Curated annotation (Swiss-Prot), chain D:
Protein's name according to its UniProt entry: Multidrug efflux pump subunit AcrB
Family to which the UniProt record says this protein belongs: Belongs to the resistance-nodulation-cell division (RND) (TC 2.A.6) family.
Induction field: Positively regulated by MarA, Rob and SoxS transcriptional regulators (at protein level).
Annotated S-S bridges: none
Subcellular location: Cell inner membrane
Record function comment: AcrA-AcrB-AcrZ-TolC is a drug efflux protein complex with broad substrate specificity that uses the proton motive force to export substrates.
Source taxon at top rank: Bacteria
Chain's gene name: acrB
Assembly notes: Homotrimer, with large domains that extend into the periplasm, interacts with AcrA and TolC. AcrA may be required to stably link this protein and TolC. Interacts with AcrZ. Part of the AcrA-AcrB-AcrZ-TolC efflux pump.
Source taxonomy: Bacteria, Pseudomonadati, Pseudomonadota, Gammaproteobacteria, Enterobacterales
Deleted gene: phenotype: Loss of susceptibility to contact-dependent growth inhibition (CDI); inhibiting cells still contact the target.
Curated annotation (Swiss-Prot), chain E:
Description of what induces expression: Positively regulated by MarA, Rob and SoxS transcriptional regulators (at protein level).
Name by which UniProt lists this protein: Multidrug efflux pump subunit AcrB
Subunit-structure text: Homotrimer, with large domains that extend into the periplasm, interacts with AcrA and TolC. AcrA may be required to stably link this protein and TolC. Interacts with AcrZ. Part of the AcrA-AcrB-AcrZ-TolC efflux pump.
Protein role: AcrA-AcrB-AcrZ-TolC is a drug efflux protein complex with broad substrate specificity that uses the proton motive force to export substrates. (Microbial infection) Involved in contact-dependent growth inhibition (CDI), acts downstream of BamA, the receptor for CDI. Its role in CDI is independent of the AcrA-AcrB-TolC efflux pump complex.
Free-text disruption phenotype from the record: Loss of susceptibility to contact-dependent growth inhibition (CDI); inhibiting cells still contact the target.
Species of the source: Escherichia coli (strain K12)
Highest taxon of the lineage: Bacteria
Subcellular location: Cell inner membrane
Shown segment, full-protein numbering: 50 to 145 of 1049
Stated family: Belongs to the resistance-nodulation-cell division (RND) (TC 2.A.6) family.
Length: 1044, 144, 48, 96, 96, 48, 48
């Protein structure tokens, strides 16, 4: 401190090291919209083609679950089992579990359960993946010539693009939106019956005639002595053409005439699956879902992807176009540019509020160098702790400028104050002034960390979000205190010009400085006012109590949240037809959704990416989704043109015309968060009681939830209602009599109606699946079962009616399981008046009276909130103990520290005021904002209490006198920081366009918090000291008059 | 040594052997564990009113308690002091010989007459133009 | 009979097992008491 | 470098005509020329392999394909050249 | 076993390589395809990468390509090992 | 080998910068380093 | 890991001798160990 005051070049050396280290950091540092925040989750996916929901549950799901053990750090495990034939098991792990170890542990417990799953599932596969639902960029490929189907496009995407994109730098994953080609063999039962053959025969033939047969080699080891040649003997190899598959023989008639597959089935290249029809503005469309590689740059990857896509442009077939429905990058670019603009404009306002106050060009250049060193150096520490540049760490810095700026202003002011007060040369004045503020700054550093660090220690997901802000701010704050002790005392001593004793600049200039005269009266007006109302002190403490209770009422009636939504230039509507509905019935509705956005929202909507088959409630012909891309903000000016209004009028535009349920909404900030005021409930079968008994219990809870409209709202099941299904009984006895294989019966049915993956073949140098299934028109209605014949042992064809009967029944299209046992998931939210914890306690009460054997559990956000809500009072309890301990140490009393600790409510009352009046919400950006305001409130108070005591201890100045000196000589820098900070927050408060949701949340609370805190502490802190310091004995020294 | 990596490393090799083990073994479930040797604790389960047998209790523990305990982080291995229920078909050789039957015939029958059959769908995808109905086709389900 | 995973803490694992059993008990068949015939943990607690 | 590859086109047509099993002809050409790993045995207390392969002298030149016979459904033996075509191809043994 | 180089590349190698995307600290990849049906894909990682983590991340990605590979291959068994490249020593054995 | 070559220019540049900064910090003069820095090519010529 | 003064010996067939030959060698060692009671106690097969 005094060290570097005499060593300007040393101080310059450290500044340069911090600049280049922090400069190196920013240059090569990961950038993403958000950091990883959701606890690590691994998903086990499987498909049993043609299987019903019970078949998968009882055949795959239960089996895999029964084997997920001896795996470390498992939190819970949930699973779906659909009648689309798909199984999804999700395992969730403790925060900070290694996702790679978790995935390995899973993928090889599964590995030991493979031999227990059925063969069709085994050859279909079982996937294990990390479940991070955050896409960097969704690319879509269309055909503008209408020459190729989505199957045709999807294949080109796979065979000619997918691999190329996955090589690109920073590309973490590439998911194909659609199916590769597959050899499709569409069976005709009439033609099958005519030649007395079944699907079983078709399959056998393909396996025989499309295979790879190992042979040997000529002159193979061990050879004959004197062997001539060695070469591979090539036997049968996989077929390639659709034509070749046509030629394969099935049976030779008694008259020598041939029966080929060609004769009994249509043969063509087609989809591996047909559940999903994807479309872009009504056109057939394939795509790629790209995720950002861990550690990589979101911006650089986005450019690199587009550049690699540019290379392939001429190489495409006629009329094939690449289009971008989703890209996180535009929005991240705005986030980054708008935060830098804020930081840059902050320092510029520090220059102005410094100049038009101290009116000296070289004095104003000190913070202009001081803070950018701190900001550059903050990046270094981030890079050091593996952090990235993201929304949270960006708004972590803007949320902190008030503290860094203050450290620059405080150090400079004191020197300029000491010089204009005593008449010392710059070097000695800096030496003197630093002496006054040395203890203060090391104290505030210990104090400020004591309020920020504790929020890093929050558990779970939120704890991870707060960790971002916490480590960011502490790192910047601590650096600005180190800069204030090293560089800024050097810059005040080596480039500051002296001011002559008692100058104050009164008079002097004309065309530049006349405000000085006016400023010196207002400080006399404020020293007299404060001093005046120091007689009637006991009545001001009462007004303080109104500030506490007023804060308390606002703290309660302020709605709670996590992160504000943004206009991200993208949203989606979801489409829900009634159970049992067809692909075509949905596609009808989807087309109208597309039509609406393109006709009635022509100006705002760029495109509509309609997906038929995939919903969020589940999958099936039953459900679809329409993803909407917009023109960029520059084109959508009004508030009626932003996502908010568009979505609300969309729901409106669909509710009064439809037969199918159509929501419309936009994605949350982090695309995996809860509803803030909402819960996730899981009803569990803990005894024998079956599906039906569970449905009964759910229905009992849902009905009871409706009994309480004041506490819970739109509480509903997350799964799917029981639907009718067509059940076919094989009469084993009759099957045996006629002479038909019970196996032949099952596969002829299966392969026809459900499909069967027979082989692999090699399409244009690429391995692809071979599926045998019935032609569409022979597997539609129950009446079509009568087309299908099975061959009996004696070689004659028998219809199903001879050995089977059939009937309808209610089954489940989706069975759920929680932690092994059958579950039914129930969603819901706390009604307008109440909190989440309140609604939760009632649910537990409502569940406590369900039938014997029914249990419950909280999952997802409700499980998170449970195991990380027991900390918010406990942690900030430790904050205020440590803060007291630091202030006790900084001064020399167990009573003096109280005088600054009572400044806490002064900032909060303004923050709450502002957010309430703006109709905003208490959230993460608000919580951290509060902690910043409290920071300056303490920081301002610490110095005032300090200066007052320094006069009292060192100079013997009277209590009522010293406090008046302190408040007078510090009124200047308090007002300085505050005006620059408020005007630096100015654009953040009234903000439109991209990023404004967060921008407002940061600004609003911080602006209002500063306005009150500063235009309130200047009266209250001097009061606090006099009130506090009057509960101290007069025996040793009389606290009123001089001593030394 | 890192137990996680140890167990990883073994199993990479085990899978190389795995398919060479006889089916009967595989379908009995090869297990690869990182456990201590001695027991941490034994949890015992009884019936106070005697309203169930011990094979009754064993089935309960297996079917209602074991999996969650075994899934619990830090639980290295779990041994059941008893057995879970199974359908037990106690064959009679006189009665089998009577009807010209062998355990093979019995097994062949159970495999056919106790099965879960994926049976496809009515109005399944891809459908014809103008399909209105879509439902699951159910066939044979495991016996209970 | 339960065995510790290598490296796992004894008391924590024990705490979780009990806390697991706590969940299960209320759904037992009539008079299906759990009993604790062998536990190495109480010694560790008391001993320390 | 690019080795010659002796291609055998087993005529699925003429094979069924003669009565021979498609598998029977396959697993015979394999076991003769490529050898075949049948199952395991115990050598001095160690599990080792059991292989079946043709004697060296019957699997050295294209003309040796004649030497091998497959039993038909009736019971007669069928020579390979009754249901198999053969020619030369090209390609690499090591694709980098 | 028994498949030629072309058959094993586009059937095994190529399939594995496609899924060999999205793995931390990868420098480069190279692979070979044999006339003996052998395939070896080596992932060389960034200097000072944790090899045991590399191994895991690789095998996690492998096990996603596994289903898509032939039944013969899957049952022949696919290894994932930190590799060297050259021999420390060759220990020889003779009879005197 | 390519890495070794390509990295080198950056290596010397930052090494020279560091030495300069060290000398500036230790000997408070800003020009003391300048002189001693000009002595680099006098040694390098020998290595070459 | 460890009893007062106990050891854990492993006899090994290194020439493909077989179970029955190994058994004879075990018995020879066990009988030899009994002849030395002033050095070892309870020298037993751990097997069946």
């Amino acid at each position: 401190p005094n060290f570097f005051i005499d060593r300007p070049i040393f101080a310059w050396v450290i500044a340069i090291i911090i600049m280049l280290a922090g400069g190196l950091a920013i240059l090569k540092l990961p950038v993403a919209q958000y950091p990883t925040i959701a606890p690590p989750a691994v998903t086990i996916s499987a498909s049993y083609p043609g299987a019903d929901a019970k078949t998968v549950q009882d055949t795959v799901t239960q089996v895999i679950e029964q084997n997920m053990n001896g795996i470390d750090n498992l939190m819970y495990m949930s699973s779906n089992s659909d009648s689309t034939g798909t199984v999804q098991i999700t395992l969730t792990f403790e925060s900070g579990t290694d996702a790679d170890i978790a995935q390995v542990q899973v993928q090889n417990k599964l590995q030991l359960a493979m031999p227990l799953l059925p063969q069709e599932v085994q050859q279909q596969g079982v996937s294990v993946e990390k479940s991070s639902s955050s896409f960097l960029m969704v690319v879509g490929v269309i055909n503008t010539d209408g020459t190729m189907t989505q199957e045709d496009i999807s294949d080109y995407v796979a065979a000619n693009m997918k691999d190329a994109i996955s090589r690109t730098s920073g590309v973490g994953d590439v998911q194909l939106f659609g199916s590769q080609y597959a050899m499709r063999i569409w069976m005709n039962p009439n033609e099958l019956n005519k030649f007395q053959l079944t699907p079983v025969d078709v399959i056998t033939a393909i396996k025989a005639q499309n295979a790879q047969v190992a042979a040997g080699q000529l002159g193979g080891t061990p050879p004959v002595k004197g062997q001539q040649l060695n070469a591979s003997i090539i036997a049968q190899t996989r077929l390639t053409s659709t034509e070749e598959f046509g030629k394969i023989l099935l049976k030779v008639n008694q008259d020598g005439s041939r029966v080929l597959l060609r004769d009994v089935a249509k043969i063509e290249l087609g989809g591996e699956n047909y559940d999903i029809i994807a479309e872009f503005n009504g056109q057939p469309a394939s795509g790629l879902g790209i995720k950002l590689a861990t550690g990589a740059n979101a911006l650089d990857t986005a450019a690199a992807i587009r550049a690699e896509l540019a290379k392939m442009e001429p190489f495409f077939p006629s009329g094939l176009k690449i289009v971008y429905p989703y890209d996180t990058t535009p929005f991240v670019k705005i986030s980054i540019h708008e935060v830098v603009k804020t930081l840059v404009e902050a320092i510029i306002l520090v220059f102005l509020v410094m100049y038009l106050f101290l009116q000296n060009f070289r004095a104003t250049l000190i913070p202009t160098i001081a803070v950018p060193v701190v900001l550059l150096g903050t990046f270094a520490v981030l890079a050091a702790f593996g952090f990235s540049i993201n929304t949270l760490t960006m708004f972590g810095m803007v949320l902190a400028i008030g503290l860094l700026v203050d450290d620059a202003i405080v150090v400079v002011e004191n020197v300029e104050r000491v010089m204009a007060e005593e008449g010392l040369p710059p070097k000695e004045a800096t030496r003197k002034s630093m002496g006054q503020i040395q203890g203060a700054l090391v104290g505030i550093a210990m104090v400020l960390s004591a309020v920020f660090v504790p929020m890093a220690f929050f558990g779970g997901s939120t704890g991870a979000i707060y960790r971002q802000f916490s480590i960011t701010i502490v790192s910047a704050m601590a650096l600005s205190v180190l800069v204030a002790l090293i560089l800024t005392p050097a810059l005040c001593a080596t480039m500051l010009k002296p001011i002559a004793k008692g100058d104050h600049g009164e008079g002097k200039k004309g065309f530049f400085g006349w405000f000085n005269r006016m400023f010196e009266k207002s400080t006399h007006h404020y020293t007299d006012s404060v001093g005046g109302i120091l007689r009637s002190t006991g009545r001001y403490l009462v007004l303080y109590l109104i500030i506490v209770v007023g804060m308390a009422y606002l703290f309660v009636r302020l709605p709670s949240s996590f992160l504000p939504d943004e206009d991200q230039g993208v949203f989606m509507t979801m489409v829900q037809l009634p159970a049992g509905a067809t692909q075509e019935r949905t596609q009808k509705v989807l087309n109208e959704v597309t039509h609406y956005y393109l006709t009635k929202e022509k100006n705002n909507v760029e495109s509509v990416f309609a997906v038929n088959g995939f919903g969020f409630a589940g999958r099936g012909q039953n459900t679809g989704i329409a993803f909407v891309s917009l023109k960029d903000w520059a084109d959508r000016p009004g508030e009626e043109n932003k996502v908010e209004a568009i979505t609300m009028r969309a729901t409106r535009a669909f509710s009064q015309i439809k037969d199918a349920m159509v929501f419309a909404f936009n994605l949350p900030a982090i695309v995996e968060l809860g509803t803030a005021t909402g819960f996730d409930f899981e009803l569990i079968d803990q005894a024998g009681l079956g599906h039906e008994k569970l449905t009964q219990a759910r229905n009992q809870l849902l009905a009871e939830a409706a009994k309480h409209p004041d506490m819970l709202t739109s509480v509903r099941p997350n799964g799917l209602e029981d639907t009718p299904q067509f059940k076919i009984d094989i009469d084993q006895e009759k099957a045996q009599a006629l002479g038909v294989s019970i196996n032949d019966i099952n596969t002829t049915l299966g392969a026809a109606w459900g499909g069967s993956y027979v082989n692999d073949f090699i399409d244009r140098g690429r391995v692809k699946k071979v599926y045998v299934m019935s032609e569409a028109k022979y597997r539609m209605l129950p009446d079509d079962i009568g087309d299908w014949y099975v061959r009996a042992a004696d070689g004659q064809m028998v219809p199903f009616s001879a050995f089977s009967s059939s009937r309808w029944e209610y089954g489940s299209p989706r069975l759920e399981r929680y932690n092994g046992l059958p579950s039914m998931e129930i969603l819901g939210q706390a009604a307008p008046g109440k909190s989440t914890g309140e609604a939760m306690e009632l649910m537990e009460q409502l569940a406590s009276k369900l039938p014997t054997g029914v249990g419950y559990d909280w999952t997802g956000m409700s499980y998170q909130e449970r195991l990380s809500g027991n900390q918010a009072p406990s942690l900030y309890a430790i904050s205020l103990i440590v803060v007291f301990l630091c202030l006790a140490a900084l001064y020399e009393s167990w009573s003096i520290p109280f005088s600054v600790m009572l400044v806490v409510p002064l900032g909060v009352i303004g923050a709450l005021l502002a957010a309430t009046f703006r109709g905003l919400t208490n959230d993460v950006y608000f919580q951290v904002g509060l902690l910043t305001t409290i920071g300056l409130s303490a920081k301002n108070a610490i110095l005032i209490v300090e200066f007052a005591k320094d006069l009292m201890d060192k100079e013997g100045k009277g209590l009522i006198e010293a406090t008046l000196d302190a408040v007078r000589m510090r009124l200047r820098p308090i007002l300085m920081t505050s005006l620059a900070f408020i005007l630096g927050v100015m654009p953040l408060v009234i903000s439109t366009g991209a990023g404004s949701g967060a921008q407002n949340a940061v600004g609003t609370g911080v602006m209002g918090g500063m306005v009150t805190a500063t235009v309130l502490a200047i009266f209250f802190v001097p009061v606090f000291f006099v009130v506090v310091r009057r509960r101290f004995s007069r025996k040793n020294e009389d606290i009123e008059h001089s001593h030394t």
